[PDB]
Amino acid sequence: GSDLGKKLLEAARAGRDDEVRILMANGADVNAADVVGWTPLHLAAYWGHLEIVEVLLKNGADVNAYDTLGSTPLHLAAHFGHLEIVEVLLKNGADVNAKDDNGITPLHLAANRGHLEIVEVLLKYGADVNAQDKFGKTAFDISINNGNEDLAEILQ
């Protein structure tokens, strides 16, 4: 835990852009993580702060940092439907097929919440459409279980 590391976790969470800017100039650990293993990139992704995601990525943030249950920022961004953040992470090397401890992927999470554009973006970056979670489920299973016809059509 860093002095500035903690300050950065908070600023990124709060989306205080100007503060994050200053913190970057000062060398605040971009790889700082809280108790559950979340980085500022994790936090920015969760709460959907796009500029901070971009600033963190310019400053050497681990794009594929996983938390203590193995979830990545792409998981969070996909899950909470932040399309532009999803795109940015992918452009910066996010593992499109990252599995968390449950074998859950970003495609699973996006399909489960009915995020069609994000599902499309993920498929475009090579999301494995046949990937199965710990229960053998695919994003497609989720779609028809949820009764989402549009989504199902997308995944064939």
Partner: protein, 1033 residues
């Protein structure tokens, strides 16, 4: 009437004696307390849902109860919070004047009918309805010093052997245990369970079966076979009573005939019901009792009763156990009552000194000595009649009123003395003539003083309740004072005073007094010469008066406004706050460090630190804590350096560098019952379907905008908690159904093990107590423990929790708030220096109007009181003004002459403002009470001047200046005596340090500042006022 009693001194004695006996009786029967009821009645509903997160509590308990709070009368507003300690509190606040008993029973009856809608385990725990706007009389700490008892051990002892006897102690209305009685604690082991294909479900089932009360019936019960010889009750299964028995509960018979017992899969022990709070007292395990005074009780008698009871319990204490008193409001009542006595004693002495110094005979000296005590005693009798208590505020009014009774007493006797010396009339004839000169004005003065003080009783809510205490004490005192002036003191004067030869002004005596007399006689001529030359040039004095009036305006405006001044109440608090997710152990290290500081760096000021881990005021949880710091007496803490403000500021400084924690000392509110009463209290409301996240965004938006106006708003902040990481686990229904695992088993396994479960009751040495199952700590700490729990499937196979669930981190609220039934967020802040809170409120309303669609707001608490209180003030001040004028117009038979008296108001008010400003004080209720008494006194001096001046023109045909000069000459001595007596008598309030000195200093420096300028200015200005007013009309 004066004439009536001058001829009937015995009849006047009889009235005085009746008044004294009525006063004496009242003192016996009068409730004694630190404060009257001041806060509006508030009822609180408390529920607890073991192992529940905040959203669970809100959505299965809080919303249901809130939706049933209808048809209840005089409700102002309702507010609630639900948090992740499994707790909800709903507070309903009622209009001032509501019967608190009716309010409570109406709330509890609506609740009673919502119970069937609540979850089972919440019904099991019960839901309490209580009056919460009541405060603690004292707190009794119970500690163990020899390391033999845990705080659980102590709490159980107190509940079993102290609480009830204290509850029954005379005068106590309520007792609260700081902890719980023992519970039977079953600490499950998931490895041992799985080993035998058992689960918490089996553990709960076995316990409900083998720890129970079972009805049977009777032998030879009715209706019987005729000829039956005995009738006897059958006793069957009764509840378990020991850990040994619980350990021996049967869970399973193995195939080899071997037996699985509860002690084979769990650790059994007596322990707490909850483990959220860790209480220490100077580092040692602690418990205690919060005690409240019963209605109409005597706080001093109750305190002594409580200590007497504790003493007779002491012989039976186990070793190491010690009673300790970290909070006792009872000193303040004692100090207050003593002040009333000390003030009465000092006034009698001062009046003796001043009467003798000027009148130089012991007889005149006696009359006030008699009259003042009589009036004061009768004042208690009226307080009683009106249902007031002897309390800090009423007693403080008594001290002020004593100053007023002294004034009346002196004025009546002085005038008889002057009339004797000037006319040579015998005591009786002179008393008649003297009373004839002042009696009308005395009644007018009584009317005018009432008009000033009474309207303040009509401020609403809290503010009125505080002013009421003063205005009823003060207005009663001077109504009785005038009454004694028209009945007793004339009788006393006519019978007790020695004759004075006409022309005898004592200039012939030798020694100090002969000198003083010649000097004061010369001074009176120099004075009248001055006034003569002043009245030769009234133009410049009108100018000087507009200057004073202007300066008053300026001083008044720039004086900072506060409601009540802080006090050094002998105790203060230290907030401790650790980041989200911070654990109980970490908080304890900070508390320890904090406790180590006070016992070290404040060893000369600090008696004890009561560290409460797991408790905060704006949110409970493992990462918040409070240290209650108790001090030695104000006597052992000499000077400003060792008073609470100094100590706290030093403490907050020293704690600033504590690493990962927010730690700061701060003072109690002046009246704990009333709450903070500083700045504003603002509610942001989800008026549509926005939800928690969208309301947080709107909150943040408003907080950022508040921060852009540091010029008008300072410290605008949430009163609640921020979202924190939480661990979301999804049960997969399909996989459970496919494995033959029921959801009820899964969910009961998870919640019983990780959240703990209240199974049923047992009896421990004759007291009924709870039974809880829960996992031993080390099997419910981390996410990887989740997979160590197993559930038995229909087919008998044991299935690890990991087989049918998945988990992820997310954020959520550890404390959801609601206001008037809607999601809400409470925001506190204050006006920046130089600005009024009302102005700060208006901006908040303006920023609020720019928030996203569907976000509303409301004002509550102090801000609610502030608003409706602020809308009266103008109407009340005008009514006062009008009535004063009408009384004066009646008194003088004139629409214009009242103006010459009313003009004196700035003359005293300017002094008050000057003294306050210089001494750095503020305009608060005690200052305002001081402004009123300052106005009244200067009003009184002016009234008698104008009365004499006018009477001389009317009765003796004297010219305007002639009459004015003569009046002012005649009133010089009484004004000086009367002002000297009062300045000296109010001195101790000004220099007072210690108990209640904040309040004392406020009225003291105001009333003394005001008395200096009022008497110096009035003796020159009211002659001017009277002349110019007369001329103009």
């Amino acid at each position: 009437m004066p004439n009536f009693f001058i001829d009937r001194p015995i009849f006047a004695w009889v009235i005085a004696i009746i008044i004294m006996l009525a006063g004496g009786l009242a003192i016996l029967k009068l409730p004694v307390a630190q404060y009257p009821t001041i806060a509006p009645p508030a009822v609180t509903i408390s529920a607890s849902y073991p192992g529940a997160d905040a959203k669970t509590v809100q959505d299965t308990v809080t919303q249901v109860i809130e939706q049933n709070m209808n048809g209840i009368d005089n409700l102002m507003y309702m507010s609630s919070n639900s948090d992740s300690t499994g707790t909800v509190q709903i507070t309903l606040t009622f209009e001032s004047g509501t019967d608190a008993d009716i309010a409570q029973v109406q709330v509890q009856n609506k609740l009673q009918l919502a119970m069937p809608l609540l979850p089972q385990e919440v019904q099991q725990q019960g839901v309490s309805v209580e009056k919460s706007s009541s405060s603690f009389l004292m707190v009794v700490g119970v500690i163990n010093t020899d390391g033999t008892m845990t705080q659980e051990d102590i709490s159980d002892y107190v509940a079993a052997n102290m609480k009830d006897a204290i509850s029954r102690t005379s005068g106590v209305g309520d007792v609260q245990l700081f902890g719980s009685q023992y519970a039977m604690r079953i600490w499950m082991n998931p490895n041992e369970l799985n080993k035998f294909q058992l689960t918490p479900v089996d553990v709960i089932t076995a316990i409900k079966a083998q720890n129970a009360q079972v009805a049977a019936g009777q032998l030879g019960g009715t209706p019987p076979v005729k000829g039956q010889q005995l009738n006897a009750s059958i006793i069957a299964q009764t509840r378990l009573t020991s850990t040994e028995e619980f350990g021996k509960i049967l869970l399973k018979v193995n195939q080899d005939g071997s037996r699985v017992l509860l002690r084979d899969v769990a650790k059994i022990e007596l322990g707490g019901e909850n483990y959220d709070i860790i209480a220490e007292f100077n580092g040692q395990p602690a418990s205690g009792l919060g005690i409240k005074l019963a209605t109409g009780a005597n706080a001093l008698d109750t305190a002594a009763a409580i200590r007497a009871e504790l003493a007779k319990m002491e012989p039976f204490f186990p070793s190491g156990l010690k009673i300790v008193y970290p909070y006792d409001t009872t000193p303040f009542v004692k100090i207050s009552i003593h002040e009333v006595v000390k003030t009465l004693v000092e006034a009698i002495i001062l009046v003796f000194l001043v009467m003798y110094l000027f009148l130089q005979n012991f007889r005149a000296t006696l009359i006030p000595t008699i009259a003042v005590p009589v009036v004061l005693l009768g004042t208690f009798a009226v307080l009683a009649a009106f249902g007031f208590s002897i309390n800090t505020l009423t007693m403080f009014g008594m001290v002020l009123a004593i100053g007023l009774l002294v004034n009346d007493a002196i004025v009546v006797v002085e005038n008889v003395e002057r009339v004797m010396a000037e006319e040579g009339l015998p005591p009786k004839e002179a008393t008649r003539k003297s009373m004839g000169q002042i009696q009308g004005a005395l009644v007018g003065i009584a009317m005018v003083l009432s008009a000033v003080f009474v309207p303040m009783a009509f401020f609403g809510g809290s503010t009125g309740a505080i002013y009421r205490q003063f205005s009823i004490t003060i207005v009663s005192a001077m109504a009785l004072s005038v009454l004694v002036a028209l009945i007793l003191t004339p009788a006393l004067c006519a019978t007790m005073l020695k004759p004075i030869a006409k022309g005898d002004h004592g200039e012939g005596k030798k020694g100090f007094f002969g000198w003083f007399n010649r000097m004061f006689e010369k001074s009176t001529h120099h004075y009248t010469d001055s006034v003569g030359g002043i009245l030769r040039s009234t133009g410049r004095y009108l100018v000087l008066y507009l200057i004073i009036v202007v300066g008053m305006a300026y001083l008044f405006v720039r004086l900072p406004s506060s409601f009540l001044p802080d006090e050094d109440q002998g105790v203060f608090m230290t907030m401790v706050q650790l980041p989200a997710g911070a654990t109980q152990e970490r908080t304890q290290k900070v508390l320890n460090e904090v406790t180590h500081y006070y016992l070290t760096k404040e060893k000369n000021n600090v008696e004890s630190v009561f560290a409460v881990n797991g408790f905060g005021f704006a949110g409970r949880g493992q990462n918040t804590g409070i240290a209650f710091v108790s001090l030695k007496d104000w006597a052992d803490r000499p000077g400003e350096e060792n008073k609470v403000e100094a100590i706290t500021m030093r403490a907050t400084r020293a704690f600033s560098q504590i690493k990962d924690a927010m730690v700061f000392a701060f003072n109690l509110p002046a009246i704990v019952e009333l709450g903070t009463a500083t700045g504003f209290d603002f509610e942001l409301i989800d008026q549509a379907g926005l939800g928690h996240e969208k309301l947080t965004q709107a909150r943040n938006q408003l907080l950022a905008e508040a921060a852009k106006h540091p010029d008008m708003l300072t410290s605008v902040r949430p009163n609640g908690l921020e979202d924190t990481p939480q661990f979301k686990i999804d049960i997969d229904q399909e996989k459970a159904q496919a494995l033959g695992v029921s959801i009820n088993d899964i969910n009961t396994t998870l919640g019983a093990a990780w959240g703990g479960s209240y199974v049923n009751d047992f009896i421990d040495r004759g007291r009924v107590k709870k039974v809880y199952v829960m996992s031993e700590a080390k099997y419910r700490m981390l996410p990887d423990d989740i997979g160590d729990w197993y559930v038995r499937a229909a087919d008998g196979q044991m299935v690890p929790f990991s087989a049918f669930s998945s988990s992820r981190w997310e954020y959520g609220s550890p404390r959801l708030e609601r206001y008037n039934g809607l999601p809400s967020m409470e925001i506190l802040g204050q006006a920046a220096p130089g600005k009024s809170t009302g102005e700060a409120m208006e901006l908040m309303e303006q920023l609020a109007s720019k928030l996203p669609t569907g976000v509303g707001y409301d004002w509550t608490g102090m801000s609610y009181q502030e608003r409706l209180s602020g809308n009266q003030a103008p109407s009340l001040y005008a009514i006062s003004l009008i009535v004063v004028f009408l009384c004066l117009a009646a008194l003088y038979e004139s629409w214009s002459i009242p103006f010459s008296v009313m003009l004196v108001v700035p003359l005293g008010v300017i002094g008050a403002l000057l003294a306050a400003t210089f001494r750095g004080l503020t305009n608060d209720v005690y200052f305002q009470v001081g402004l009123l008494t300052t106005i009244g006194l200067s009003a009184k001096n002016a009234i008698l001047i104008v009365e004499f001046a006018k009477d001389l023109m009317d009765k003796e045909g004297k010219g305007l200046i002639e009459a004015t000069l003569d009046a002012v000459r005649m009133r010089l001595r009484p004004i000086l005596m009367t002002s000297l007596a009062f300045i000296l008598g109010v001195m101790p309030l000004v220099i007072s340090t210690g108990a209640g000195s904040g309040a004392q200093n406020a009225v003291g420096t105001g009333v003394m500042g005001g008395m200096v300028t009022a008497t110096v200015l009035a003796i020159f200005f009211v002659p001017v006022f009277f002349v110019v007013v007369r001329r103009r009309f």
